[PDB]
Write a protein that binds this DNA or RNA. Structure first.
Ligand code: NA
Lengths: 115, 115
RNA sequence: UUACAUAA
């Protein structure tokens, strides 16, 4: 399988889904550790949306599109995470810096009560 | 949406899946924080399996069925996470104690590179 | 009447 790295953002097809799950083709952020990312057929990712541009919850991290290379201002949803097989991935969009990933890590810890 | 709690174990159908995403009806462990569990229509869960013969990865936590009231000795796969609509949850099996959840937390931190 | 894969 393709190698990916924590911090990578890829388009992925998350369909089909049930109820309030996030579906469709959308950007996703790789949040699995890099050992699994190297050896496993699967990655763990967080959904990104543009339906909001500002964080509503402490599990949200805003992405400034111009700074980070996105089409529009988006938000990473650390309450919407899932293990996906790498075949769902298509094109790599970008790789987020440490400033962003530190915010992602805090949001993930809150999301999963690891605080 | 129904109230669930971190530490709860429910059956859920994780299918349909692609590739090596954990599929089928199986127990899942709620790992989302309880504020999210109260206010959101989705729950973040980890898949559980009974294939205890596979090599134990650092993202795996073993469940002794006699102690914890399961049908057979099982393994919590913290590399297999899903955010699912609560309507997927069916029968409640049990609620895991703090000793078990401390091991889950450690494995989750390894899975998501939050060590 | 409830997987496979994945950690030098
Ligand atoms: Na693909």
């Amino acid at each position: 399988s393709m190698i990916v790295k924590r911090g990578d953002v890829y388009f992925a097809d998350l369909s089909p889904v049930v109820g309030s799950e996030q579906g469709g083709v959308r950007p996703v952020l790789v949040i699995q550790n890099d050992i699994g990312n190297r050896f496993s057929p699967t990655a763990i990712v967080a959904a990104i949306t543009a339906q909001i541009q500002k964080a509503k919850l402490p599990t949200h991290v805003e992405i400034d599109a111009k700074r980070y290379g996105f089409e529009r201002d988006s938000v990473i949803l650390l309450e919407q995470i899932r293990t996906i097989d790498k075949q769902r991935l298509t094109d790599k969009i970008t790789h987020l810096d440490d400033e962003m990933m530190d915010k992602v890590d805090e949001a993930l810890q809150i999301s999963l009560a690891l605080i």
